[PDB]
Design a protein around this nucleic acid. Structure first.
Length: 50
DNA sequence: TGCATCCGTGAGTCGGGTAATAACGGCCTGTACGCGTCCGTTTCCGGCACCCCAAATGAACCGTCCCTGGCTCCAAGGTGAACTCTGGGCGACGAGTGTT
């Protein structure tokens, strides 16, 4: 499933589509620590992803 | 009346082919073959009596497969504002450190 299908807000889509994350399969493959590593990552994005 | 004297059957199994004599004219014919000629056949040149036969030459011609006309009623391009990062800009604070 793509991350857009999760019907989320501005920042998470922006910071994901620049770097080529297209699905939630790679997102569930990546752990919370491996996804929070990104510079200027929103804590609200962390909350919604968790 | 023996008695020698023939005399009549064996005896199994799956490389070829090796020769003589007096005979000689002359006539007949006979069946097969070789000549010259004539007639039925048959096969075409071009003719009709016409058989007409026909693809090609005028129509419509009407439905239909293309043009032009106007009309929408909407969903995409144009017009807003914010905001959550996104990024840079500002500022203060602290020990490892250039020096005699």
């Amino acid at each position: 499933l793509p991350i857009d299908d999760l019907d989320l807000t501005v920042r998470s889509y922006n910071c994901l589509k620049r770097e080529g994350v297209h699905t939630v399969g790679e997102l569930v493959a990546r752990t919370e620590s491996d996804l929070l590593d990104i510079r200027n990552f929103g804590q609200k994005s962390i909350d919604e992803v968790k």
